[PDB]
Coordinates of C-alpha atoms in Angstrom, one line a residue:
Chain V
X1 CA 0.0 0.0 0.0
X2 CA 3.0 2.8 0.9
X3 CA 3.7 3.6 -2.5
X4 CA -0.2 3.9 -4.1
X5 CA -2.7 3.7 -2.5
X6 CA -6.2 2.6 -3.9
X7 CA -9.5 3.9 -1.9
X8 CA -11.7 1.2 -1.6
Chain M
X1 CA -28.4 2.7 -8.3
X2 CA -24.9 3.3 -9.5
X3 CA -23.9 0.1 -8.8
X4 CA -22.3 -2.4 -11.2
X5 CA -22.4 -0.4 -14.3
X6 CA -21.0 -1.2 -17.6
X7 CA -17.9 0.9 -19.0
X8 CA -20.5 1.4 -22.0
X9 CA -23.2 2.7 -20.0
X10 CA -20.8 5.0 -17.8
X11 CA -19.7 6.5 -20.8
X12 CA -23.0 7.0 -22.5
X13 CA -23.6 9.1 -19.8
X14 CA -20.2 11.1 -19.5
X15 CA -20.7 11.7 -23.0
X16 CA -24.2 13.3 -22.4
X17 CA -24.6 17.1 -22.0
X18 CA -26.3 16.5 -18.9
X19 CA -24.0 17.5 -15.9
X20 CA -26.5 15.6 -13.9
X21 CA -26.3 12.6 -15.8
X22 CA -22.2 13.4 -16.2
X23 CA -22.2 13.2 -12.4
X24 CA -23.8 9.9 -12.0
X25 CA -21.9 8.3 -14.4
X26 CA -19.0 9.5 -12.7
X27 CA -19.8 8.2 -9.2
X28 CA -20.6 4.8 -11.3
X29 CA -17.5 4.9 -12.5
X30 CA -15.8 5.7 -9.1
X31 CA -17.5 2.6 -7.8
X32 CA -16.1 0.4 -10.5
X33 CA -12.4 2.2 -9.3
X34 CA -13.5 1.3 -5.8
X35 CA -14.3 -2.4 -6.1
X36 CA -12.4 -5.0 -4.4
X37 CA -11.5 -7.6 -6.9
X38 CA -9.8 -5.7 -9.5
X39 CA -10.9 -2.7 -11.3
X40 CA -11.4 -2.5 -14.3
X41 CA -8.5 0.6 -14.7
X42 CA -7.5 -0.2 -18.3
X43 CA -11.1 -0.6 -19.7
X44 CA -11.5 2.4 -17.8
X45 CA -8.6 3.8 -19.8
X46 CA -9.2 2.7 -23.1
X47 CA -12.8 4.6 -23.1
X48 CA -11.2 7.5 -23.0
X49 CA -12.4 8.7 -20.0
X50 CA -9.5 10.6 -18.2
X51 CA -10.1 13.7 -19.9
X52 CA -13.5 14.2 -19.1
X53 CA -12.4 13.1 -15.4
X54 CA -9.9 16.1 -15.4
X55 CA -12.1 18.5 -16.8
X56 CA -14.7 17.1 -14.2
X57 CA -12.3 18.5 -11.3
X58 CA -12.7 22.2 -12.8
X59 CA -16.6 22.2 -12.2
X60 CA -16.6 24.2 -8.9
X61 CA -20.6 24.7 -9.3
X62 CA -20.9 20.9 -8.9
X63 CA -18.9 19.7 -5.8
X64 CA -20.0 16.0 -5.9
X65 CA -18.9 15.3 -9.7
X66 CA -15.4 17.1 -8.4
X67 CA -15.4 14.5 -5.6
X68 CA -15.9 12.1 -7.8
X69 CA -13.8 12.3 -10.5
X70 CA -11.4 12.9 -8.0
X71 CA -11.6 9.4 -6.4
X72 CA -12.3 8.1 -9.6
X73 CA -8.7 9.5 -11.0
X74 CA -7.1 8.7 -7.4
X75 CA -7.6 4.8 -8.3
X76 CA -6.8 5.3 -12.0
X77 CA -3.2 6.4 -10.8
X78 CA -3.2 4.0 -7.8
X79 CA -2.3 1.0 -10.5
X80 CA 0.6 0.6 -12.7
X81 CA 3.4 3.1 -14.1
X82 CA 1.4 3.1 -17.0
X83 CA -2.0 3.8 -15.6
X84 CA -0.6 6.8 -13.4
X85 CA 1.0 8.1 -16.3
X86 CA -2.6 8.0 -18.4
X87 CA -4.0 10.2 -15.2
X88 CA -0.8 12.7 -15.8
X89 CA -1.0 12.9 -19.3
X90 CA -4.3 13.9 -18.8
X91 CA -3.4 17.3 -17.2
X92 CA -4.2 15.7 -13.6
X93 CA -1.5 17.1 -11.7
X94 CA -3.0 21.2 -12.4
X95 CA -6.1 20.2 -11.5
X96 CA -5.2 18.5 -8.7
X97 CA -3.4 21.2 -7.3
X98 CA -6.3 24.0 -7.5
X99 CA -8.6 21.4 -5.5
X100 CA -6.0 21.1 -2.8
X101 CA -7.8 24.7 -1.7
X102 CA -11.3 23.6 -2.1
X103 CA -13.6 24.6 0.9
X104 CA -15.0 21.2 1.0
X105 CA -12.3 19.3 2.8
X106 CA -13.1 15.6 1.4
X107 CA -12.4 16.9 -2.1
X108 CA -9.0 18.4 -0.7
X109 CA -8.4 15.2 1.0
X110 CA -8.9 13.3 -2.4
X111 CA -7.0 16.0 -4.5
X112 CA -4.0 15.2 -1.8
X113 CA -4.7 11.6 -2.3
X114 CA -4.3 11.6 -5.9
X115 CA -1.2 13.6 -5.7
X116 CA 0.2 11.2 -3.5
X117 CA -0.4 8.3 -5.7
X118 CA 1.0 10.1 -8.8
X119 CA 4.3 11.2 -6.8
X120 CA 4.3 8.0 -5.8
X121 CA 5.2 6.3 -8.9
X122 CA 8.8 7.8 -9.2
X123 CA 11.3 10.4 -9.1
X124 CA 10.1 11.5 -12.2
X125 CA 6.4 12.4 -11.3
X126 CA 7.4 13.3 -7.7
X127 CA 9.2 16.2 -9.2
X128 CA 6.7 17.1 -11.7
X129 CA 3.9 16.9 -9.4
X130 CA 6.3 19.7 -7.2
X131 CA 7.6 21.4 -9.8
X132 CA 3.4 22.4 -10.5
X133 CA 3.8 23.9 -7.1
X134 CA 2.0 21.3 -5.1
X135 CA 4.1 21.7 -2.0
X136 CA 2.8 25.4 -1.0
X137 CA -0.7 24.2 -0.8
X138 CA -0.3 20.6 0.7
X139 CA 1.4 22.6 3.5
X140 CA -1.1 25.1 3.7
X141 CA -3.8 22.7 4.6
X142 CA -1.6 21.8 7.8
X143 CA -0.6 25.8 8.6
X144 CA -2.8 25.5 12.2
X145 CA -2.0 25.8 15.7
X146 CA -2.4 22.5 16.7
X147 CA -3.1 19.5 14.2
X148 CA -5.0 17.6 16.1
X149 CA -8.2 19.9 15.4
X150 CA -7.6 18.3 11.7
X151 CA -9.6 15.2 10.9
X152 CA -7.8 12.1 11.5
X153 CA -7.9 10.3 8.0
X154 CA -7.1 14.0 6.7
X155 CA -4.0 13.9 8.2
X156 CA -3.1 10.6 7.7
X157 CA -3.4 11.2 3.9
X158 CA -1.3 14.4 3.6
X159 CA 1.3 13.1 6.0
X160 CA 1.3 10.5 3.2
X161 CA 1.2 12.2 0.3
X162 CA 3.9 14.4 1.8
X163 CA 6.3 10.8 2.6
X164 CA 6.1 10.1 -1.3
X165 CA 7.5 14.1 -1.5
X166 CA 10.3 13.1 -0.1
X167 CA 10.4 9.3 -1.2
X168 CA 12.7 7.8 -4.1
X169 CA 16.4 8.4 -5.4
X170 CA 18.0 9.0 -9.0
X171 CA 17.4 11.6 -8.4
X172 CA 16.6 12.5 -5.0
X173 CA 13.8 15.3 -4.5
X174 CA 15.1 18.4 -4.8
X175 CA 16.4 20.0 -1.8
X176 CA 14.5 23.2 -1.9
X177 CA 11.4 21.0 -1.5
X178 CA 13.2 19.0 1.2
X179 CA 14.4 22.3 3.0
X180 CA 10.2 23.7 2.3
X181 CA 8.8 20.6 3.9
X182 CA 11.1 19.9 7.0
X183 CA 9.4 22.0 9.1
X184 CA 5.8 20.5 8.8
X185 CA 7.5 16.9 8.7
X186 CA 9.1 17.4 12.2
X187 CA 5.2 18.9 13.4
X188 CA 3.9 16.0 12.2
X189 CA 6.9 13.9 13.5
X190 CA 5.7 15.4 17.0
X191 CA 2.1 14.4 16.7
X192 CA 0.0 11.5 18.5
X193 CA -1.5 9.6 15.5
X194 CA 0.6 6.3 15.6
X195 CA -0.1 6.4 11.3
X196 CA 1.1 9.9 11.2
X197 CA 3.9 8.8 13.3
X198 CA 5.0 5.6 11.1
X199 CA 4.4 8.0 7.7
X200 CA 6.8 10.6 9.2
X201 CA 9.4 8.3 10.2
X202 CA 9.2 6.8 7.0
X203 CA 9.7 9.9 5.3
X204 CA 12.4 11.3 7.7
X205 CA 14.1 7.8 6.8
X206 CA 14.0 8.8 2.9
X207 CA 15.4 12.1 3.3
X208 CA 18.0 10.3 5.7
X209 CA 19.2 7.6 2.6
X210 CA 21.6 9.5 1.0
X211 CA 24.8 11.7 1.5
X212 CA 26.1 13.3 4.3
X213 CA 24.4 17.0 3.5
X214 CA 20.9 15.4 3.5
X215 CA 21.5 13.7 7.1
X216 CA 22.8 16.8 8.0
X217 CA 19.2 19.1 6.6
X218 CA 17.7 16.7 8.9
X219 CA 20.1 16.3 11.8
X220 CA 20.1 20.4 12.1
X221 CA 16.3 20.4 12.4
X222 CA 16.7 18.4 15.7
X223 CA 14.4 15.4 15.0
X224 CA 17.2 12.9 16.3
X225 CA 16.1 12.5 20.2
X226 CA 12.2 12.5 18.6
X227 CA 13.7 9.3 16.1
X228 CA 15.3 7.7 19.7
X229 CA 12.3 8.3 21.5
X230 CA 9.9 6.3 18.6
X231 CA 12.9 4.1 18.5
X232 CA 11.6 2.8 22.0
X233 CA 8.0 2.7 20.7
X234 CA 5.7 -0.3 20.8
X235 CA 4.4 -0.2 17.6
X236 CA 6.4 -1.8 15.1
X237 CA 5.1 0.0 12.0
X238 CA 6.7 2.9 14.1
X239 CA 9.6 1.4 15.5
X240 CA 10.7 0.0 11.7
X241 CA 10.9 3.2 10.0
X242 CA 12.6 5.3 13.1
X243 CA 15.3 2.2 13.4
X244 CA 16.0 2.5 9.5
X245 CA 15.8 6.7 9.9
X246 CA 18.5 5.9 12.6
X247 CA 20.4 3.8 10.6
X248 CA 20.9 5.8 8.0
X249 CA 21.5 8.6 9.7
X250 CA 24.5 6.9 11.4
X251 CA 26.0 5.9 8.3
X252 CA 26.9 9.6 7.9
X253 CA 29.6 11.0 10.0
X254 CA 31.1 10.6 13.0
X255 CA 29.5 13.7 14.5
X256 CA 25.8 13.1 12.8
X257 CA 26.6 9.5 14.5
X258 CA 27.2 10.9 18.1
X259 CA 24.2 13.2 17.7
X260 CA 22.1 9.8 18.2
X261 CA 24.3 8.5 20.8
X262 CA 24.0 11.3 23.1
X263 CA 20.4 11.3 22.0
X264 CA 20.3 7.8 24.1
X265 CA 20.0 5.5 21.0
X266 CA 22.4 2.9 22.4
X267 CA 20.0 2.3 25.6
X268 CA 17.0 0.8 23.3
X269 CA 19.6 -1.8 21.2
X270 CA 19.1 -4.4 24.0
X271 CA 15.7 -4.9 22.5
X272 CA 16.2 -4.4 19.2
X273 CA 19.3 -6.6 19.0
X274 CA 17.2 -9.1 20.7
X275 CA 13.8 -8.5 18.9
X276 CA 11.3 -11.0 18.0
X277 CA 11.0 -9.3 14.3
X278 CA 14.3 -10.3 12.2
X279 CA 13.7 -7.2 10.6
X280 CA 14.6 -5.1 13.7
X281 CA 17.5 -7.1 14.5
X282 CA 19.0 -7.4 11.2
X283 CA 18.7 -3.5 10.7
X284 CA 19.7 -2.6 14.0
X285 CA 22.9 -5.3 13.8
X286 CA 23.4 -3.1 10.5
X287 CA 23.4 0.5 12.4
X288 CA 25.6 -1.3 15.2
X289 CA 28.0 -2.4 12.6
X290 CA 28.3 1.4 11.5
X291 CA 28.4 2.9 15.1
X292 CA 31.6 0.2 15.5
X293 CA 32.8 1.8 12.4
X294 CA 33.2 5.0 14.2
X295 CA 35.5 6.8 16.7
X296 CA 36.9 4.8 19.6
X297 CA 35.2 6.7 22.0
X298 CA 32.0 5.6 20.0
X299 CA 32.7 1.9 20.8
X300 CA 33.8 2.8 23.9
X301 CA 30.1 4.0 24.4
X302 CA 29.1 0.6 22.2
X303 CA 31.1 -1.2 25.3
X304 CA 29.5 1.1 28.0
X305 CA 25.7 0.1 27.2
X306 CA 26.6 -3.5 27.1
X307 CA 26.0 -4.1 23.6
X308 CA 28.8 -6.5 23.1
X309 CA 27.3 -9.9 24.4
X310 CA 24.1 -9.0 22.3
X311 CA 26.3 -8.7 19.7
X312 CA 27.9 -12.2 20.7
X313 CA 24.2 -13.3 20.7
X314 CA 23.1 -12.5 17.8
X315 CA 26.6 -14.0 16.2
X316 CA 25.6 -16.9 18.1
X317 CA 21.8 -16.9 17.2
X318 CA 20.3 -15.2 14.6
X319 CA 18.7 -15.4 10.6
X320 CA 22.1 -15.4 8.8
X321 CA 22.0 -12.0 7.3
X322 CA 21.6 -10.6 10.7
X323 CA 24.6 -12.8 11.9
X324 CA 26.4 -11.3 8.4
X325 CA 25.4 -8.0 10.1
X326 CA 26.8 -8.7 13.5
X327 CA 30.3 -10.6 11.7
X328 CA 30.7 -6.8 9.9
X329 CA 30.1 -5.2 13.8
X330 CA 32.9 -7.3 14.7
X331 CA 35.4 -6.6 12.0
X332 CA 34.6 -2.6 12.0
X333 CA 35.0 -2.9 15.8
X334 CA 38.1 -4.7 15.6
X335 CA 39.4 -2.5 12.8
X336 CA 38.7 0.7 14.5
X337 CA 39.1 -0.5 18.0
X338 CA 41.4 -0.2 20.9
X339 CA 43.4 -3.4 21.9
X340 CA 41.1 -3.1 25.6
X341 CA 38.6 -3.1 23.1
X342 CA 39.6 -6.2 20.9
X343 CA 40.5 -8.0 24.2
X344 CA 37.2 -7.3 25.8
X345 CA 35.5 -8.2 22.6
X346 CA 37.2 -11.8 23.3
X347 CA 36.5 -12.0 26.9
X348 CA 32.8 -11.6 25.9
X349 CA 32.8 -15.1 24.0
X350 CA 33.2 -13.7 20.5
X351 CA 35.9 -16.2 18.9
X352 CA 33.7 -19.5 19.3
X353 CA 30.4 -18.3 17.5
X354 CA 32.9 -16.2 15.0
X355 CA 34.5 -19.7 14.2
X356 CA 31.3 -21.5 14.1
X357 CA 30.1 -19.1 11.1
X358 CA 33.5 -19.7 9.6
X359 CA 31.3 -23.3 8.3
X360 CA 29.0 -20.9 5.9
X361 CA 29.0 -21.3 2.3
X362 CA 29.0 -17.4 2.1
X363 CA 32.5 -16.0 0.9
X364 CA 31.9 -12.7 1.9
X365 CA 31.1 -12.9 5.8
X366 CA 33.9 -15.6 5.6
X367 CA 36.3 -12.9 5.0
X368 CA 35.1 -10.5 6.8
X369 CA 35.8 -12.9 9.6
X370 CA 39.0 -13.7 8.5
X371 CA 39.8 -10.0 8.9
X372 CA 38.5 -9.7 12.0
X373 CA 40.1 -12.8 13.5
X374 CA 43.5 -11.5 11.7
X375 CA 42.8 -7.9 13.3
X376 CA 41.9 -10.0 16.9
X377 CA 45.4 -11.4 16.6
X378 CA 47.6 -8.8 16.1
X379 CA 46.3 -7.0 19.2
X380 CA 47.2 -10.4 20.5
X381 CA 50.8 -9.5 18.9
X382 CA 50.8 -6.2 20.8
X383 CA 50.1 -8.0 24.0
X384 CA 51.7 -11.1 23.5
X385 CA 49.3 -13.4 24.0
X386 CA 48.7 -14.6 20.3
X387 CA 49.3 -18.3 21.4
X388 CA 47.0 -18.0 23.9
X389 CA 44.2 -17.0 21.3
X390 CA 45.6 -20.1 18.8
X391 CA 45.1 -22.4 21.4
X392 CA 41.5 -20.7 22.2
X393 CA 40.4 -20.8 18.4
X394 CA 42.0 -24.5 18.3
X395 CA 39.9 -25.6 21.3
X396 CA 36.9 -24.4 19.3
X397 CA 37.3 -26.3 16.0
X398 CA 38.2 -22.9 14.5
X399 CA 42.1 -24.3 13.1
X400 CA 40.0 -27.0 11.1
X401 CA 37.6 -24.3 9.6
X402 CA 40.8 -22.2 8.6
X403 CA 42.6 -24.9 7.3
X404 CA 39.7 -26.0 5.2
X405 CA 39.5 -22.3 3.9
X406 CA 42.9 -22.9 2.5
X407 CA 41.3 -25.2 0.1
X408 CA 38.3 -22.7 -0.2
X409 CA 37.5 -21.5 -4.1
X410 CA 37.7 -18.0 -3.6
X411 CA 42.0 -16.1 -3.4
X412 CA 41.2 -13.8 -0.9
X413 CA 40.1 -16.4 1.3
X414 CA 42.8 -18.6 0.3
X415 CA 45.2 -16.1 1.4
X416 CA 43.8 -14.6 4.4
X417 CA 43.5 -18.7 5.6
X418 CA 47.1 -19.2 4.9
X419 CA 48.4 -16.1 6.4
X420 CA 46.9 -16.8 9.7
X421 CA 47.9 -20.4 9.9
X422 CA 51.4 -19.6 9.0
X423 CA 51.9 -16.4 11.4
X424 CA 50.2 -18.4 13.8
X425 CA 49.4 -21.9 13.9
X426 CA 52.9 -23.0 12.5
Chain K
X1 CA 32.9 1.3 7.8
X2 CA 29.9 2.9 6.6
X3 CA 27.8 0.2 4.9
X4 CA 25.3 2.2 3.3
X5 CA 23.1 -1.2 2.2

């Protein structure tokens, strides 16, 4: 997750 | 209602001069993004949506389709190199920016979201996302008093947005930015979220992995008893990033290195040299084996706390790379060390465990060991006692491992081997 | 001395 990070 | 759309119907309706019907295709597209089991980002792509997604975030007389494109392009660039790259070429990154000062803060949130994704993918788009002038209103939105009257989740996302500012070499961000952000990193450094915490220490650890002159922008800003003090924290997704911020820092110089001495580092290695995680033991052997690469009276200090037997143990007990860790700890200390210093070393029990990883197929720690046993011995010379130490390594087994090295495959070791057996066990 | 990974 610490490079992208999706918003689920 | 907006759930489980086609790609063909959302763009029916993103393609309708309806901003209404714009909007819901948008949020129906936001909940494809959204969806657990992989999203459908390059179907996504291929309809040529970004665009209209980008242009959406310019429609300040309709908040929710902002908000939605927003989370819709935050997912987009939350995949692949590629797939960020199709949100950037897209003429995200402006946009972005001029919803960082929207007045409703969950569209801020998700412009700093999206910018954190896109800065995430390299050096490359980290530095284009600054040099659009992202950094002036990221730090705006955390110009209060006191943080904690920000909501929780909205700090959490621009403290990390803000790590992946400072995150990623070749190149390294620019130190302007580095030098603009410091200030707000060490607030947020100081603050009680143990996320925020973690995301900080992380960052501090990025602008720490490099040179000497970036330890020092961070050093001077005083951070380095906060780092010892989350050093000692429970958490381990704090305790990880403040041991490698440590680390790094003392791989700078001697001074930079004493800075975390005197700010008590050495008093929390008893745990970490003994901690359950091999992580924290293999990276804290790592920062020991560059503190013993430092001044004598940084040893001495090494000595002083007691690290020595944890050293011994971990060279007697440990996943190999950490006992490759603790074999370079011994050679730097006997290279840089004091004959008290080497003799103590032995008195701690540090030649039978050195012998016994003499038996690894590894050719590096092999000589490393070979130095330091070579290094051991001629403080032996200066004292005279060098037969006593043959007879101690002979007791251990350690004359048949050397011997054996002689018919190793590898020169150095071939030579190291023979040189000890001849100036000593002849 | 001085490691630097």
């Amino acid at each position: 997750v610490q490079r992208k990070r999706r918003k689920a | 209602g907006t759930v489980n759309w086609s790609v063909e119907d959302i763009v029916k309706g993103i393609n309708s001069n309806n901003l209404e019907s714009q909007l819901q295709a948008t949020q129906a597209a936001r909940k494809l993004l959204s969806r657990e089991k992989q999203p459908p980002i390059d179907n996504i792509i291929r309809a040529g949506l970004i665009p209209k997604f980008v242009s959406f975030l310019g429609k300040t007389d309709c908040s929710p389709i902002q908000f939605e494109s927003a989370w819709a392009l935050t997912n987009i660039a939350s995949g692949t190199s590629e797939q960020t790259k199709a949100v950037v070429d897209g003429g995200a990154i402006p946009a972005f920016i001029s919803l960082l000062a929207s007045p409703h803060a969950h569209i801020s949130e998700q412009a700093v979201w999206a910018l954190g994704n896109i800065a995430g993918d390299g050096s490359a788009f980290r530095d284009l996302v600054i040099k659009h002038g992202a950094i002036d209103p990221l730090l705006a939105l955390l110009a209060v008093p006191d943080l904690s009257t920000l909501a929780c989740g909205y700090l959490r996302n621009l403290t990390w947005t803000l790590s992946n500012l400072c995150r990623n070499k070749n190149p390294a961000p620019p130190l302007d930015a580095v030098e603009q952000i410091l200030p707000t990193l060490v607030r947020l450094l100081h603050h009680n979220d143990p996320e925020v915490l973690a995301d900080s220490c992380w960052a501090i650890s990025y602008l720490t992995d490099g040179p000497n002159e970036r330890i020092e922008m961070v050093v001077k800003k005083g951070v380095v008893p906060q780092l010892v003090k989350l050093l000692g924290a429970t958490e381990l997704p704090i305790v990880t990033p403040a041991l490698r911020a440590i680390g790094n820092i003392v791989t700078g110089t001697d001074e930079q290195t004493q800075k975390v001495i005197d700010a008590g580092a050495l008093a929390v290695f008893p745990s970490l040299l003994t901690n359950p995680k091999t992580n924290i033991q293999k990276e804290a052997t790592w920062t020991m084996s560059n503190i013993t690469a430092g001044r004598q009276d940084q040893i001495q200090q090494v000595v002083n706390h007691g690290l020595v037997p944890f050293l011994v143990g971990v060279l007697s007990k440990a996943d190999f790379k950490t006992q490759k860790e603790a074999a370079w700890a011994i050679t730097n200390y006997t290279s840089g060390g004091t004959v008290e210093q080497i003799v103590y070393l032995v008195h701690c029990g540090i030649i039978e465990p050195l012998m016994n990883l003499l038996s690894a197929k590894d050719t590096k720690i092999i000589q490393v060991i070979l130095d330091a046993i070579s290094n051991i011995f001629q403080a032996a010379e200066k004292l005279g006692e060098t037969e006593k130490l043959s007879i101690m390594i002979e007791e251990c087994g350690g004359l048949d491992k050397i011997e054996a090295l002689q018919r190793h495959e590898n020169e150095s070791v071939y030579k190291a081997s023979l040189n000890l057996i001849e100036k000593y066990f002849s | 001395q001085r490691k630097r990974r």
